[PDB]
């Protein structure tokens, strides 16, 4: 696995001194709007959305290797980040049509990789929804789309992070037991597909392959995987790609995310860090809305800081440096 | 308690043949937008919001005495209602500033009572947030505002429904045990305040005075009220006003709402019906978004119909006619 010198340097900028991606995610758009609105039964303003991102960026990027932000609301937050923190910018439009099964990808209309680099990104993230068992023609379209982005990133010589969120065309709720029973296949086989050279991907941002709340020991109810089956799922994930890959939190609790990382490492996964969002900053939303900006700053300086510092200490003992998977050429 | 002939006739139009208000609530605006958005991680369109209201109105108003709708998205739904169903229209802007404690009221800027009557309302609903223990000057402002609306409704000779949602300036979460411990006081004393002639109110739309999930027998955890204390709370509510009053569902389950009505009646409350929303139609949102319009129609014709028919059968044995509290003069 061979990176250009420039892509290597950009990847170093979004990583810590140990060659692990210990990154903070806050590119949420519509999702954040709804999280805020619940506290007042009316929509937040643009100013409120931009300001909360600034606060999270200011207060927590001294403790992260980089931050992921959206162009729509996150550009002030990007400017406010710690000098040693790198920047990722999201390139996809959010979401999908709930009434079709295809969940096709679409880039933000005002952007190109070139423009995202010009705006200060060290790396570009694109989220793709993918069902490996879905309509083959849909998946041809998806593969073609990713090839285009991979080619843009090759030309602009900037790292391409592909985020894969799995789904099943036939299952509505990804939190269900029914989905838990197919998730390992969905996650690991999608990674296999997108490991092909033709997609130009530098880092995969992926789900852990199991739903941990259904793993023996973690399960309060039905158990879908034994501890050993879950461990096998992590080994199979590691075997599904030679690219660097990192985990998203999926908004699980800080404690569960920490436990998942420990479990992953014990099983044999050599994951290369995380792009961790809600698990770190979730509690700031209510404080910001109800108590205001300085109160939210104080939450970030206490509870947020505790969350991210605990994450960093887990990462030191669980994550593997990406420099061991990749070299310059 | 004395109503004008015209107000009496309008109230009859929004009631069933037994003189009970068996009304369907669907004036939700921002709240509905977020309920829909969760199914696709992007906002619904205006067309989608208007269409779901039409479907709910078309399919369920044959089984309700009236429907409550908002002017913003609900006017097509109002036109689509069953010929025997009356119409209520909401007059307030939704929500409040989460960062202040005053939650002051504000009418929709394009509307007046006259215009709402012209648009086809048989009655007008206004939602006020009220903390009886809050800042006395805030509560003067609130009382003055309600007096204005009461006066408009007197002039236009149309029934005024005041919805009171209680809160505590010092408690953020109304679902908490801490709020459950003050709710009876908040609800019943607010009703006492707004029973004064000067407010011109014809019907109060109010919360049940307890949080039932903390009542002995219903409680899965901590118990805040014994069954007898809860029964006393309902008697105290009935004693807090001579106006007709009806219960909102607050989005509890259909089963819990049914049980609450039975409990209320057994305790001695002579509540005069309900304006019931989410408890009836909640499940239609996911079906509409994921499976489409005709699928949502089929949900309404099956599960929705079962919900509302079960509500009507409970109402027949639990609700008291308002005609026993009020006569023409
Ligand atoms: K860095
Ligand atoms: K490998
Ligand atoms: K009627
Ligand atoms: K009374």
From Swiss-Prot, chains A, B:
NCBIfam families: lacD, PRK04161.1, PRK12399.1, PRK12858.1
Catalytic reaction(s) noted: D-tagatofuranose 1,6-bisphosphate = D-glyceraldehyde 3-phosphate + dihydroxyacetone phosphate
Pathway(s) annotated for this protein in UniProt: Carbohydrate metabolism; D-tagatose 6-phosphate degradation; D-glyceraldehyde 3-phosphate and glycerone phosphate from D-tagatose 6-phosphate: step 2/2
Pfam families, sorted: DeoC
Enzyme Commission identifier(s): 4.1.2.40
GO MF, any single term: tagatose-bisphosphate aldolase activity
GO terms classed as biological process: 6-sulfoquinovose(1-) catabolic process; D-tagatose 6-phosphate catabolic process; lactose catabolic process via tagatose-6-phosphate
KW Ion transport (keyword) present: no
Recorded superkingdom: Bacteria
InterPro entries on file: Aldolase_TIM (IPR013785), DeoC/FbaB/LacD_aldolase (IPR002915), LacD_aldolase (IPR050552), Tag_1.6-dipho_adolase (IPR005927)
Keyword Acetylation carried by entry: no
Taxonomic lineage from the root: Bacteria, Bacillati, Bacillota, Bacilli, Lactobacillales
Family per record: Belongs to the aldolase LacD family.
Name of the protein in question: Tagatose 1,6-diphosphate aldolase 2
UniProt-listed SUPFAM superfamilies: Aldolase
Secretion signal span: none
Keywords assigned by UniProt, alphabetized: Lactose metabolism, Lyase
Top EC class, one word: lyase
